[PDB]
């Protein structure tokens, strides 16, 4: 998938005039207007469309079969189609049975595997095990500055722009000669 997860930001397209002025007032009012429109629409459509015949009885069955407090364990040498070995956090090698809900693909050795608490059984795959000390380093509220805020560093800014922005802005410019973009 390789999701190109952006900074999930830019919710401020940026007010053009910074001098207190009715132009600022009107523009920010437009911003608020669209934001309120979005809130209203999402709430209204959540309430409407009576799909209350939801839960897709079957998914309820799956949740039922996978009990409460599921545990996180590391999959290990997979033995048979309907059988595999798991290693709990205490490093104990149980021998569980892969139930049908689990896609036989996506379950490779070393991939964190969900389990049923009572009868250790691979119930589902987990593709989000990023170290909670590492996910805290993703910027999700883009700092509010623009290349115009910085000044007097033309030559020293063009150099970074030619290796952090242009290579993904117009990558044809680079391939046309075949030079690999500086990294």
């Amino acid at each position: 998938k390789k999701t190109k997860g952006p900074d999930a930001a830019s919710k401020l397209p940026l007010v053009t005039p910074h001098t207190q002025c009715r132009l600022k007032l009107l523009k920010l009012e437009r911003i608020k207007d669209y934001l309120l429109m979005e809130e209203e629409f999402i709430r209204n459509q959540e309430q409407m469309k009576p799909l209350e015949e939801k839960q897709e009885e079957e998914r309820s069955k799956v949740d039922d079969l996978r009990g409460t407090p599921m545990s996180v364990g590391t999959l290990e040498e997979i033995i048979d189609d309907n059988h595999a070995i798991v290693s709990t956090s205490v490093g104990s090698e149980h021998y569980v049975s892969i139930l049908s809900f689990v896609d036989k693909d996506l379950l490779e050795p070393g991939c964190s595997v969900l389990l049923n608490h009572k009868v250790h059984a691979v119930i589902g795959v987990l593709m989000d095990d990023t170290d909670p000390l590492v996910t805290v380093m993703k910027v999700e509220k883009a700092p509010q500055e623009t290349y115009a805020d910085i000044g007097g560093l033309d030559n020293q800014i063009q150099e970074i722009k030619e290796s952090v922005e242009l290579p993904l802005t117009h990558p044809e410019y680079y391939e046309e000669m075949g030079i690999k973009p500086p990294k």
Binding site: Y34, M37, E38, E40, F41, M48
Partner: protein
């Protein structure tokens, strides 16, 4: 009003005609009212296929927000009409 003389396809044409009118005239009154009613009156019953045209025409009357509200329309569209 004169186009109120037909079946739900009259509502179709109503949405279409309002949209075809307000091409870039960014407003909130008509946009809000259509955005709301079109999807709050046609998804429940068998008669449907209107709730697509309003959003698919938010561009019209909004496609030229001095190139400012475009970055907001993108947010509303992408978040809502898909997710």
């Amino acid at each position: 009003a004169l186009e109120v003389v037909s079946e739900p396809f009259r509502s179709f044409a109503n949405t279409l005609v309002d949209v075809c009118a307000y091409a870039g005239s960014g407003n909130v009154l008509k946009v809000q009212q259509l955005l709301h009613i079109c999807s709050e009156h046609f998804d429940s019953k068998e008669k449907e296929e209107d709730k697509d045209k309003k959003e698919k025409k938010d561009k019209d009357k909004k496609e030229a927000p001095a190139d400012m509200g475009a970055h907001q329309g993108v947010a509303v569209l992408g978040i809502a009409l898909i997710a």
